[PDB]
Design a protein around this ligand. Structure first.
Ligand code: NI
Length: 207
């Protein structure tokens, strides 16, 4: 087993460990960052395999979270029109519709104010106006194989969660671990175009 991954932004290691439910013939088939949450200057981010959907067929659910920070100068949010960029890893197939597109039915985007996207539309929140997700979108390109979430505005104890499912491609090499994602990042602030923060990356393999 690889013991670590490396955050590209700051070039420090994170530990990775066995995912519960991934044991098969005395070996484990999946690894998660430990811890899977990372404290960044703007708040907290996280990424993990959060469930095993079908171990033999190498299908897993993936979960990302982000939460922000309130600053007084005027209140301001540390995450302000922020963007998540989440490329699928090499040999990782995102689970898509019958139509071959990433549709509302293939992901969830929810927030801790009780808002969520429903068929692409933000609903709920304490004002029933879409709340924390009023301006959020989930985008996918089938060629680049990359999810983006735009429109994040988050202060203290304001948190958003994304889930989706993936499957290891049949062309896997035996015993090789594959990162579930390419470099996965949060750009917290539209006003700071060069500030980027890495999410840690889970890994999977088959025999
Ligand atoms: Ni629904």
């Amino acid at each position: 087993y690889p013991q670590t991954g490396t955050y590209p932004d700051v070039q420090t290691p994170y530990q990775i460990i066995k995912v519960d439910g991934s044991e098969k013939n005395g070996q484990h088939k999946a690894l998660n960052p430990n811890p899977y949450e990372r404290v960044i200057p703007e708040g907290t981010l996280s990424k993990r395999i959060y469930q095993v959907n079908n171990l033999d067929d190498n299908q897993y659910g993936i979960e990302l979270t982000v939460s922000g920070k309130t600053v007084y100068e005027t209140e301001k949010k540390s995450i302000e029109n922020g963007t998540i960029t989440d490329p699928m890893g090499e040999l990782i197939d995102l689970q898509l519709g019958t139509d071959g597109r990433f549709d509302p039915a293939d992901y969830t985007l929810t927030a801790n104010d009780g808002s969520r996207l429903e068929n692409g539309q933000a609903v709920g929140g304490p004002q029933n106006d879409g709340g924390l997700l009023k301006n959020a979108k989930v985008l996918y390109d089938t060629t680049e194989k990359r999810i983006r979430v735009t429109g994040l505005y988050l202060g203290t104890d304001e948190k958003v969660t994304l889930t989706y499912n993936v499957r290891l491609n049949d062309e896997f090499v035996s015993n090789k671990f594959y990162d579930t994602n390419g470099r996965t990042t949060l750009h917290p602030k539209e006003v700071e175009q060069n500030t980027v923060r890495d999410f840690p990356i889970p890994k999977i393999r088959d025999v």
